[PDB]
Design a protein around this nucleic acid. Structure first.
Lengths: 136, 197, 191, 194, 172
RNA sequence: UUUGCUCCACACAAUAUAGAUGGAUACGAAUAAGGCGUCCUUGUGGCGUCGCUGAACCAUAGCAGGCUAGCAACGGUGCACUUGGCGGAAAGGCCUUGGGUGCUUGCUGGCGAAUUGCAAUGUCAUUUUGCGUGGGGAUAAAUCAUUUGUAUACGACUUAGA
RNA sequence: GCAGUCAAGCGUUCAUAGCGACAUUGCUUUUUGAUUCUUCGAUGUCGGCUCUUCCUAUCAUACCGAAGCAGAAUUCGGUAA
RNA sequence: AGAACUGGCGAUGCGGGAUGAACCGAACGUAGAGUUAAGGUGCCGGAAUACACGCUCAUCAGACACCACAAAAGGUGUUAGUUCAUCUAGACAGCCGGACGGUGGCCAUGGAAGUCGGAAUCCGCUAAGGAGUGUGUAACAACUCACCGGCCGAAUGAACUA
RNA sequence: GGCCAGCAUCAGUUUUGGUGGCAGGAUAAAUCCAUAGGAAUGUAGCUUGCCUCGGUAAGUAUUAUAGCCUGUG
């Protein structure tokens, strides 16, 4: 007989856990937790993204589901080496989170001419969808 | 942004939602509040029952019929909190109150319309996990509201009708996504993806 | 002081099975099924190796930590209640008036009536909760046996008998009358 | 609260109940319920459509009845119309019982029995304006009282600076709606039975 | 009183004819600016030596920066405070990244738990804890455990709109 | 009480406004958890996927949006009808059938715009009432006075009288 | 006028069932003073009668707790206007 | 009620303290623009439902100087700390085992052996076993605590401070 | 040639952004690089003892198949 209990997976605050800065000067760059100061402050390092090593509050960052093996208290040179070895910036770009993020600056960078072209293209696509939907 | 905004009162705080609505009413936005019987109040049930009893005993001595009127319905209890947040004795404050409608449960046509919530007023987003809260429907019944079972019977019937509508909508949405997925791999689909669409 | 991590383990025996849906614990065993709603406590359950369940509390205060241990005890009480059962035994004590207790039935509810308590002409009726089996004991003078699966349903039905036969306006130290718990044990033998 | 959905009337109404809907019966053309009677002039769909709505909806069903004042020695000549709630199962047959009883009569023996306790609802005898001594039972002032002794001496304190709602004061006495309970029935008589 | 900085201040006890070249006392002062740092320096020499602002001068004031501003340490701090009844001595341990930041949270913590204002707190010594298990407070011991992972089983993310068209989810 | 009363299509007028200018776009429930997809022994099931805001989705090109020529599709959409069903909590709305007709920017064209002269909301709502054309329908009461006393200071109330 | 704190002692032994000295902390404005702010181009002065309402520091009734409460009768205390 | 110094009110509006002759800010010709004071920024109400660290749950919470009151004494409520004690030679709590040998001690007498009561507190064995912590017997018996261990696994006990 | 406005170039007052060049501190401190020393919340390895052919568990071992700290430059 089964003894099923739901797991309810959570993003743990841990050494090696990759963060995403949402408030501050970075505002969208990737960093990794190096050492845990207390329940609300952590030490992060974003050397590939350009984030200086600093003590940040947990309310200014959002944890990502990416995790890589990083020693506790590893310096900037050590963090940057394990970051490229695990290819953190490649796994992040393949996630739907970054593809949803990268989509929204692309729409914000649309010119007035490009906004007209999107209108035309969506009208051609809507013709094919309506034809396919009305025959099934 | 919308002609009429319909707010679902379930899971909200009576004070933090009223202050949000009172500011929207003064700015000229029509607000309809549904399901006022599922509003939440911070503090245990015995706290709020004692507070209402303190309010209940406040009445004019020489004529009880012209004193403070202690309304028992959940819609009017939320209205009383909202009325004191608006300068209702002026012409500007009276016109703001005609832009507001509060109901128990979800009434007609506002049942066929979209309902929204106020993020800074949800009980789950403001209260610490472990704090005790009171339901407005249960508190109103304990002070003299006699329509809790009527609303609960009508609300149960409404949810059955809305579940059948969602099954048709969910099945139609899946058919739409199949045609939109077939719309991919084409020239117009790849050009749209280059422009962020 | 906001303990970061406090945790208790729950041992599940051979025959029974535990299923939890986001707080809803269902313990199914040889003696039956027990269900509990724990949605007021806010703990986290996790299954380890199909023979042990761990309950964890993250960033909880002293009062919230104190609610962790009672979760394990309530589940263990549900577990031991469906393997070993729960069996309460009481004795009737009286000085002059023989207490007469019989099983009656009105509207299909199986009430427990009490007669001749301190000579009272009033008949006190006690309703039996669902799952509790009331049987009169043998070879022991004035003993009743309460048996069931849920400990909080057997003991509460037991508490109803103990509180219905109270003595008023007299000296309690002299009038030693009532329906008192003698021994709280288990239904199954050898344990 | 409760809300009436629709009302269905009988095909033929007597002059006793028709007189209720008028203030000047002798001058009127007596056109009441003449166009409504054309609903039964059809196959019956106009009435049957309303009955089906009462069976589906309307968890509470009440019957409209009016007294037979012509059998009563009063000179009113105008019947009294009232609603009486039906007690029974299966809301559908409440409509069916009322439908089969349209223009039919109901006696007391089918409603009340002997040794039954009932509540009587009526308006008290009127007495007009009455002083405070008899309206409220207050004690009369002594004989030496100036400006009248059939009054209430003190009608309130200095503070609050108002007359309380709970002080006895003169006004209308009688003609109040009352309902006394626990009245035992001793005889259910029959008019035909000598 | 603000975002602190660490200063070193040297007084001199201005020379008389009888006594040239005095002893040049030195202290470390936590303050927001150089004006308060020099004021706090004279406040403590008036509690230790027969010297005041009129009888001495400030030789030098230098801002002390953290040697390793980005390495998490454990700080054992001794303080002496004035309460509503009397004077008491405390020892507390703060896990932070620098001496200045650890002092800043202490003033917040002292005011929160003991209602002690800045004017009623004396910083006796801020010392580093070299070794593990020399930390005596349990709320610092929790973060020194091996392979420490803790979740946040609730997520109140802030919103910017008065109305949202979906119910929020606190998954994390 | 001098062709009055009401309703629908329309025409001319006045009156009124707490404020139309792409679309109020409908599961429920939980939050120390769920949505969706799929499989399965249909379960408090397995697996996959999603969130981290509506920054979305649908709609959106033409004299405030013309005149016409085709191509590719058998769709999209508006309107007047029509078929059937559902909805009573304040239903007065929703879904759907059949054809008719108009438009189509899904694609390729051909003409027309100016002088309103460098910006002046540049009028685009519905609200009631009035008044005339003409397409249907309907053919009463109340009050005073008189009278009654189950009522009553007076009004009111309760009755009666072709 | 009313209520606490401390507990030397009384209570057959046993401080605190009940009390409770020496001290000390308060509350109330139903006492009486103290004051002179309002009113001397006037707020009709004691008591009773009559009538309403409110307060609880509860005499009785309701439900309980405690006792040096066997029963009976009382005593103390609590929720209570 | 009566003095001393100074600033105010009286003779003074204005912004703030909801409200007030004295308090805070600041003193005033008629206007415009910019910046602030004191005080404030959930709504009434113009302005962050800002950020940061904590504390508090109150079956009469609390919320801002003048100011419109609260104390002594208490609380295994919770938080932080002080001092002492046990402590890597396994504590606390729980269960389990022993809990005695010389010896019914010297006393008293209807009767008293650890336990009605008065006066004494030692020896052996040793890991420990008190002329004995309570129950009980006419008196013994039986049971138990002090005390020492068996197993279970790290902080725990006491008095205080705010 | 009034009255009401628009724009441009100016002047006076002021508000809100973007950006450049320098001067100071321990001539920022760090990060970084080099070197020496060291420790555990002890990495690989070694060894021991349980075990669904391997995962753990405590001893050894100061950089190795992880790293860190301190000093100096």
């Amino acid at each position: 007989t089964d003894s099923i209990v739901k797991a309810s997976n959570w993003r743990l605050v841990e050494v090696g856990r990759v963060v995403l800065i949402k408030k501050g000067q970075s505002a969208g760059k990737l960093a990794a937790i190096v050492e845990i100061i207390d329940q609300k402050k952590v030490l992060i390092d974003g050397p590939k993204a350009g984030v200086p090593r600093q003590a940040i509050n947990l309310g200014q960052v959002v944890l990502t589901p990416l995790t890589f093996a990083l020693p506790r208290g590893a310096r900037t040179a050590t963090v940057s080496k394990k970051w490229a070895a695990a290819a953190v910036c490649e796994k992040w770009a393949a996630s739907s989170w970054a593809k949803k993020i990268a989509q929204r600056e692309r729409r914000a960078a649309l010119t007035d001419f490009e906004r007209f072209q999107v209108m035309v293209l969506r009208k051609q696509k809507r013709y094919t969808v309506k034809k396919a939907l009305a025959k099934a | 942004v919308e002609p009429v905004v319909v707010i679902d009162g379930k899971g909200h705080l009576v004070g933090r939602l009223a202050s949000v609505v009172a500011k929207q009413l003064l700015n000229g936005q029509k607000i309809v509040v549904v399901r006022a019987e599922e509003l939440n109040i911070s503090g245990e049930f015995f706290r709020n029952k004692l507070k209402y009893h303190d309010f209940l005993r406040k009445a004019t001595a020489f004529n009880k019929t012209r004193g403070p009127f202690h309304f028992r319905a959940p819609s009017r209890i939320f209205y009383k909190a909202l009325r004191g947040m608006v300068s209702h004795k002026t012409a500007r404050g009276k016109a703001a109150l005609e832009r507001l409608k509060v109901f128990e449960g979800i009434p007609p046509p506002y049942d066929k319309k979209k309902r929204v919530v106020v993020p800074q007023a949800l009980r789950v987003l403001r209260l610490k996990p472990g704090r005790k809260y009171t339901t407005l429907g249960k508190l109103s019944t304990s002070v003299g509201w006699k329509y809790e079972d009527v609303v609960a019977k009508l609300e149960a019937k409404r949810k059955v009708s809305s579940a059948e509508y969602y099954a048709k909508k969910r099945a139609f949405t899946k058919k739409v996504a199949s045609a939109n997925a077939t719309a991919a791999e084409s020239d117009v689909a790849k050009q749209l993806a280059a422009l962020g669409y | 002081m906001k303990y970061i991590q406090t945790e208790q383990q729950i041992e599940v025996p051979e025959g029974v099975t535990v299923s939890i849906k986001s707080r809803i614990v269902k313990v199914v065993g040889p003696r039956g099924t027990l269900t509990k709603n724990l949605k007021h406590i806010d703990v986290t359950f996790t299954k380890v190796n199909n023979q042990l369940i761990k309950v964890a509390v993250h960033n909880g205060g002293r009062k919230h930590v104190a609610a962790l241990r009672t979760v394990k005890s309530l589940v263990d009480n549900m577990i031991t209640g469906v393997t070993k059962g729960y069996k309460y035994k009481m004795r009737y004590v009286y000085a002059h008036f023989p207490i007469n207790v019989n099983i009656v039935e009105k509207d299909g509810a199986k009430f427990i009536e009490v007669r001749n308590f301190l000579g009272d002409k009033k008949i006190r009726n006690v309703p039996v909760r669902d799952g509790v089996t009331i049987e009169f004991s043998t070879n022991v003078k004035d003993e009743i046996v309460l048996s069931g699966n849920s400990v909080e349903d057997v003991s509460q039905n037991a508490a109803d008998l103990q509180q219905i036969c109270r003595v008023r306006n007299k000296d309690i130290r002299k009038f030693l009358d009532g329906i008192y718990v003698s021994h709280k044990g288990f239904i199954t033998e050898d344990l | 609260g409760l809300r009436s959905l629709t009302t269905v009337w009988a095909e033929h109404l007597s002059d006793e109940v028709k007189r209720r809907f008028y203030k000047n019966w002798y001058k009127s053309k007596k056109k009441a319920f003449t166009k409504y009677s054309a609903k039964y002039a059809q196959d019956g769909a106009g009435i049957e459509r309303e009955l089906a709505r009462i069976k589906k909806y309307a968890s509470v069903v009440r019957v409209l009845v009016h007294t037979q004042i012509r059998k009563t020695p009063l000179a009113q000549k105008k019947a009294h119309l009232a609603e009486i709630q039906l007690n029974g199962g299966s809301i559908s047959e409440k409509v069916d019982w009322a439908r089969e009883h349209f223009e039919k009569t109901v006696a007391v023996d089918s409603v009340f029995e002997q040794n039954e306790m009932i509540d009587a609802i009526a308006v008290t005898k009127g007495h007009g304006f009455e002083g405070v001594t008899h309206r409220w039972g207050t004690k009369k002032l002594p004989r030496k009282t100036h400006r009248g002794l059939r009054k209430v001496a003190c009608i309130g304190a200095w503070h609050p600076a108002h007359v309380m709602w709970s002080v006895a004061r003169a006004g209308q006495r009688g003609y109040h709606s009352r309902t006394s309970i626990n009245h035992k029935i001793y005889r259910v008589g029959k008019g035909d039975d000598e | 009183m603000a975002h602190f900085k660490e200063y070193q201040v040297i007084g001199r006890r201005l020379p008389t004819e009888s006594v040239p070249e005095p002893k040049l006392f030195r202290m470390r002062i936590f303050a927001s600016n150089e004006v308060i740092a020099k004021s706090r320096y004279w406040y403590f020499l008036q509690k230790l030596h027969k010297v005041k602002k009129a009888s001495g001068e400030i030789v030098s004031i230098n801002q002390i920066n953290e040697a390793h501003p980005t390495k998490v340490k454990n700080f054992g701090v001794w303080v002496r405070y004035d309460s509503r009844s009397g004077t008491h001595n405390m020892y507390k341990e703060i896990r932070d990244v620098s001496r200045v930041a650890a002092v800043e949270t202490l003033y917040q913590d002292m005011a929160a738990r003991h209602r002690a204002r800045f004017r009623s707190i004396h910083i006796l010594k801020v010392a580093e804890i070299e070794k593990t298990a020399d930390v005596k407070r349990q709320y610092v011991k929790q973060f020194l455990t091996k392979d420490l992972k803790f979740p946040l089983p609730h997520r109140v993310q802030k919103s910017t709109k008065t109305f949202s068209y979906k119910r929020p989810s606190t998954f994390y």
